[PDB]
C-alpha cells in the first residue's frame, strides 16, 4: 500500500538548521509532485514547498524562501526538507504529502490538484527556553468573589498548584497553561469563595515547579 | 490569496452541517476539502470543487461558485466531528483556509462563564503587567476572544488557549493580554470578549 514516513523532527535553537526525511513506499516518487505541509500547534495548515515529479522543478512559501530547499533522492525513494537560520515560528508538525496531478510547473493550465496521502508528521520545535522558575503574582479579589494566582513564565511543564496546601479544594479551577511565543508557559489558578470571608478567612496558593526546584506560597487578599 | 472559513460550526446528530470558505474570484479555482481529527494527519473528503474521493461516505458534497465553497456534510454523526479545512491553488502556490470546527452536539450547550483579572501590583512593580481572561463551563468547545483598549481592537501580546476538557465535561480556556505598565495606565478601560456559539460576553477592569 502506499506509504508516507517522515522523519529528523526534534527541539533546536533559533538559528540552527535541521533536515527532514520523507520515505516513500508502494509506489515512486518519481512519478509524483510531492509536498511538504506544516501545522503549529493548534493551528491551521500550512503550504511549505513542493518539488515535480522530474526534480527538475522546486517551489516555496514565502515564509520560507531562501531557508528552505525541498530534494528528492532517487535512490532511495526519499524526499527530504533542508531547514536553515530556524525561527521560531518554523514550530510545526512538518507532513508529507502526494499530489497526484501536478507534473511539470509552472501550470500550463489551472491546477486541479490535491493531496491524496500524508504522512504521519514529524515534529519540530524550534525554542531558546531553557529551565526557568515562574514569577508568581496574587490576583486580588475585587455573592461570592472570584480570586487566584498568576504562574507567569515557567519551563517546562508542569506546574501544579493548591490552595491552604490542599485543605481548601471547593470551588478551585486551575488552568491549562498557554504556551507563548517565546517558548515560556503561564498558567492561572482561581478560587472563588464568599464575598463575606474576605476578612477573616486565609488564602494562600501553593504553586510547585519541580524541574526548577521552585515551591513558593503567595497569600492572596482583597485591595 | 486569502481563504477565510468560520471558526466554528455546531450541529445536533442527523442535522445538515455546512462549511463555507471565501475567497476572491473561488469559482475560478478548484476547492478540495480536508477532515483532520486531533492528533491524526488530514484526509482529503473533496476534491475538485465536488468530487469524491473513494471510501468517502456520500453524506459528505462539496460546490463552488463566485467567492464561495461550501462543504456540506448531511446527516451528520460523531464520527464528522472534526477541523475542516478549505484548499486552492495560487500559480504554483498552494493555500489553505482558516480552517473550521464542526462540533456534534452530545451534551446540552453551555454559556461560559469568564472571569477577568487586572495587572497585580506586585507584577506592575517589575516593570510588566498581564490580563487574565479566564473562561470556564462552556460547550462547544469553541471561543473566540478578542481584547479592547477602551473601544479600539489591540492584536498585539495577546496569547490564548486552545480549548480542552474540565472534569465536568464541558471546556475551559484562558486568554492573556502582555502589555506595559505604562500602556495599562494610559487607557481608561480594558475588556476581554468571548463569543461562543453566537453569543458575547464581556469583562472589563480598569486601572482604578
Known amino acids: 500500500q502506499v506509504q508516507l514516513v517522515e522523519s529528523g523532527g526534534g527541539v533546536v535553537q533559533p538559528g540552527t538548521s535541521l533536515r527532514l526525511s520523507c520515505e516513500a513506499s508502494?509506489?515512486?516518487?518519481?512519478?509524483?509532485?510531492m509536498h511538504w505541509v506544516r501545522q503549529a500547534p493548534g493551528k491551521g495548515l500550512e503550504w511549505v514547498a513542493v518539488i515535480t515529479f522530474d526534480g527538475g522543478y522546486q517551489y516555496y512559501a514565502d515564509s520560507v524562501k531562501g531557508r528552505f530547499t525541498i530534494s528528492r533522492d532517487i535512490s532511495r525513494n526519499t524526499l527530504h526538507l533542508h531547514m536553515n537560520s530556524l525561527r521560531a515560528e518554523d514550530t510545526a508538525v512538518y507532513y508529507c504529502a502526494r499530489d497526484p496531478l501536478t507534473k511539470l510547473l509552472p501550470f500550463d493550465w489551472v491546477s486541479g490538484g490535491y493531496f491524496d496521502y500524508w504522512g504521519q508528521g514529524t515534529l519540530v520545535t524550534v525554542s531558546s527556553a531553557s529551565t526557568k522558575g515562574p514569577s508568581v503574582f496574587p490576583l486580588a479579589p475585587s455573592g461570592t468573589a472570584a480570586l487566584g494566582c498568576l504562574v507567569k513564565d515557567y519551563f517546562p511543564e508542569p506546574v501544579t498548584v493548591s490552595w491552604n496546601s490542599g485543605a481548601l479544594t471547593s470551588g478551585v479551577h486551575t488552568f491549562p497553561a498557554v504556551l507563548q511565543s517565546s517558548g515560556l508557559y503561564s498558567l492561572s489558578s482561581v478560587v472563588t469563595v464568599p464575598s463575606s470571608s474576605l476578612g477573616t478567612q486565609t488564602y494562600i496558593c501553593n504553586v510547585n515547579h519541580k524541574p526548577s526546584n521552585t515551591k513558593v506560597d503567595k497569600r492572596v487578599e482583597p485591595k | 490569496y486569502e481563504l477565510t472559513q468560520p471558526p466554528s460550526v455546531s450541529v445536533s446528530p442527523g442535522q445538515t452541517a455546512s462549511i463555507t470558505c471565501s475567497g476572491d474570484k473561488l469559482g475560478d479555482k478548484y476547492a478540495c476539502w480536508y477532515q483532520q481529527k486531533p492528533g491524526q494527519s488530514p484526509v482529503l473528503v473533496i476534491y475538485?470543487?465536488?468530487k469524491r474521493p473513494s471510501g468517502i461516505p456520500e453524506r459528505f458534497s462539496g460546490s463552488n461558485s463566485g467567492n464561495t465553497a461550501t462543504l456540506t456534510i448531511s446527516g451528520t454523526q460523531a464520527m464528522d466531528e472534526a477541523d475542516y479545512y478549505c484548499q486552492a491553488w495560487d500559480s504554483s502556490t498552494v493555500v489553505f483556509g482558516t480552517g473550521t470546527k464542526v462540533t456534534v452536539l452530545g451534551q446540552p450547550k453551555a454559556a461560559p462563564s469568564v472571569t477577568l483579572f487586572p495587572p497585580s501590583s506586585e507584577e506592575l512593580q517589575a516593570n510588566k503587567a498581564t490580563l487574565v481572561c479566564l473562561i470556564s463551563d462552556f460547550y462547544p468547545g469553541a471561543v473566540t476572544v478578542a481584547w479592547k483598549a477602551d473601544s479600539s481592537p489591540v492584536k498585539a501580546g495577546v496569547e490564548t488557549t486552545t480549548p480542552s476538557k474540565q472534569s465536568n465535561n464541558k471546556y475551559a480556556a484562558s486568554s492573556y493580554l502582555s502589555l506595559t505598565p505604562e500602556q495599562w495606565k494610559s487607557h481608561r478601560s480594558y475588556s476581554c470578549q468571548v463569543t461562543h456559539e453566537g453569543s458575547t460576553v464581556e469583562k472589563t477592569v480598569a486601572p482604578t
Open positions: 475538485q470543487d465536488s
Open positions: 508502494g509506489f515512486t516518487s518519481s512519478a509524483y509532485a
